[PDB]
Design a protein around this ligand. Sequence first.
Ligand SMILES: *[C@@H]1O[C@H](CO)[C@@H](O)[C@H](O)[C@H]1NC(C)=O
Ligand SMILES: [Cu+2]
Length: 235
Amino acid sequence: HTLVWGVWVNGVDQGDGRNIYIRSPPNNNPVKNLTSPDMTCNVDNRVVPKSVPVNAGDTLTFEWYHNTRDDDIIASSHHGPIAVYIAPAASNGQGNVWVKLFEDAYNVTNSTWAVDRLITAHGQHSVVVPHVAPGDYLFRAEIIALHEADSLYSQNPIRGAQFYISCAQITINSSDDSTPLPAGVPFPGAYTDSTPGIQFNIYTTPATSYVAPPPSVWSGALGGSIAQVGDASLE
Ligand SMILES: *[C@@H]1O[C@H](CO)[C@@H](O)[C@H](O)[C@H]1NC(C)=O
Ligand SMILES: [Cu+2]
């Protein structure tokens, strides 16, 4: 159970983004229904009044929290991967538009899931803004908690993979559009019950065997990292 507070750009806090430049749902409940429109940008997908200005090569940092800013972030039980996608704002996230900028599942060296490292990073994970066409965009940050993913939601609706999905309105101003955005996947639609990484038993399968859901990260991406860039407690 986790939500996005706001973003940082190049290590600078852009301020509380909730219902402002983040298309915030009303609470931190997970999405589980792979076929639901809620898979696109969570349960209250509507235009919010601000869009954060960035330039290609900027570091865009999502900041997550559980109940209050810079708390325990997400329950330690919620082991799983983290991905970031991008689509043009004109789509409203509909169609084959979502391009993967970032993937992190399991780190064999540190023996830690993306979520484990997200807690250590005080909820902060980043992408580098790509050299796409100037204009308005949706950045879709997705945490998959796998603690009940031995079941499929489609089969047992009280279990299944849990999706914490947040869409940020981002305006890319300065960009040479040298890496124009290629074709995207649909949400809902990219993830199905047979998709690798959707049904997984983190209690019996080695984390080293985990494969995260496709698609693969775009070659045009520059992203990106799970790591604290700023200290919220200094404000
Ligand atoms: C899952 O979402 C689909 C598509 O909106 C919907 O038809 C179906 O009833 C949902 N399942 C549940 C259990 O609500
Ligand atoms: Cu939860």
